[PDB]
């Protein structure tokens with residue numbers, strides 16, 4: 307009731323993973339570069355916006 | 368009915384921020 | 399949609415662009431929306447007496463893209479609640495050119511909910527006693543939050559109707575996590591103590607310690623293993639978890655589909671391992687979060703009860719009850735004393751992400767039956783297999799893919815929590831899986 311369904315799920319997952327299209331070096335590098343660029347854009351824009359508004363909020367509030 | 372564009376949305380978003388700043392500044396120089 | 403129709407037209411709306419917006423103006427509008435979001439996130443509300451009380455909704459500030467004591471206090475609540483109430487009304491059969499009425503009533507109800515939320519947020523006393531604040535100040539705060547929610551809805555529609563990339567929910571949530579990581583890396587804040595001056599940012603503290611301390615080895619050791627401020631072993635773990643999530647999200651079961659209506663277009667239908675892209679993470683984080691805020695409000699009132707003592711026992715971190723067994727352990731080091739808590743947490747995180755994924759594939763119309771119907775309606779057939787066997791070949795993949803992408807995403811969240819990575823596990827997963835969506839949009843628009 308528990309051993310058989312779990313074993314079947316494990317086998318299905320293993321077959322799915324061994325049949326998926328795993329990334330290679332070039333695809334991994336491309337995705338890593340894109341994620342790094344997006345993270346840099348969003349995080350650093352937010353960081354600069356927060357830096358600008360610390361003195362401003364200190365003055366007004 | 369009302370169908371604004373992206374430019375009116377940006378203008379309203381900037382004017383709301385500006386109004387909040389004016390309220391804060393008025394409070395600071397009135398208190 | 400007819401009785402309330404008078405009230406569903408007055409609110410503003412966004413015009414669909416006449417021509418396809420180029421990938422330059424779309425990025426420009428996305429950047430403008432992001433800048434407006436951030437600036438409103440850094441602007442405090444007017445009328446606040448003292449933001450010195452513990453945040454009642456600290457736990458949902460990440461999922462909701464909120465920032466306490468500022469204009470973006472509700473975050474993406476106007477977007478989320480409007481959609482949720484629309485789906486609830488549709489499912490309950492209360493509600494059914496009808497698209498314009500639906501999209502008007504959605505925004506009309508997502509502002510009533512925004513006002514109700516702006517009233518619940520004030521009576522909590524996080525802005526001070528409402529009696530001391532006064533009716534005028536409470537009304538002014540409610541109006542500011544109403545206008546902020548209207549701006550949130552307008553920006554989301556700006557991003558969705560074609561003027562920008564993605565949606566507000568994804569962009570704002572990813573931004574508040576990327577900004578949090580970058581701030582914990584480069585914080586100018588200096589938490590002084592008996593030892594001396596040290597920056598709250600890991601890299602800035604590394605430079606400051608390598609400059610001002612004679613014992614350079616004990617400066618590198620400190621800047622790498624601080625237990626009071628973000629160190630560099632928490633920023634290296636962040637990069638490692640980013641890399642692992644990037645590798646595991648690139649998995650896909652490429653199905654060779656082949657159209658039979660217009661013969662000539664051979665293609666690939668990718669069934670990603672992360673079938674439900676971070677939806678299990680959003681659902682699990684939303685459950686626990688809205689349950690800590692409830693077991694935390696019910697731990698003040700009705701204190702010392704039994705239902706309260708079992709739902710959660712707070713100190714503000716949980717120390718018992720249901721809330722304790724849902725909270726991540728304090729890294730792998732805090733597992734030795736309580737092994738059963740760690741076992742229950744690792745089990746709950748996997749068995750909740752899996753359940754949420756396999757339920758979302760049936761609720762969001764991505765089940766094998768729905769994909770088979772799409773294939774039949776578009777003439778698509780699997781190349782090697784037959785035409786009537788598409789449902790079987792999709793049922794042998796999609797359910798297992800959803801379940802295992804729930805287990806994998808839950809395990810990545812657990813690993814990130816156990817490695818002490820900055821941004822948490824939910825945040826690092828919600829950041830990577832959302833930046834990947836924008837990467838997919840980028841490649842799609844650049845190839846089309």
Ligand SMILES: COc1cc(F)cc(N2[C@H](C)CN(S(=O)(=O)N3CCCN(CC4CCCCC4)CCCN(S(=O)(=O)c4ccc(N(C)C)cc4)C[C@H](C)C3)C[C@H]2C)c1
Pocket residue numbers: 454455458461462474475476478479482483515518522567571680684685687688691692693695696
């Ligand atoms: C200390 O004070 C307390 C104490 C307490 F005992 C309870 C509370 N209540 C209050 C009501 C305030 N609210 S609330 O207004 O902040 N609200 C949550 C509301 C709950 N329901 C149902 C809603 C309301 C019904 C009609 C549509 C929907 C959860 C709805 C969704 N959620 S979600 O799950 O977080 C979530 C889900 C998905 C995402 N994506 C990124 C896609 C993000 C978040 C969001 C709501 C907007 C937030 C808190 C609640 C604890 C506050």
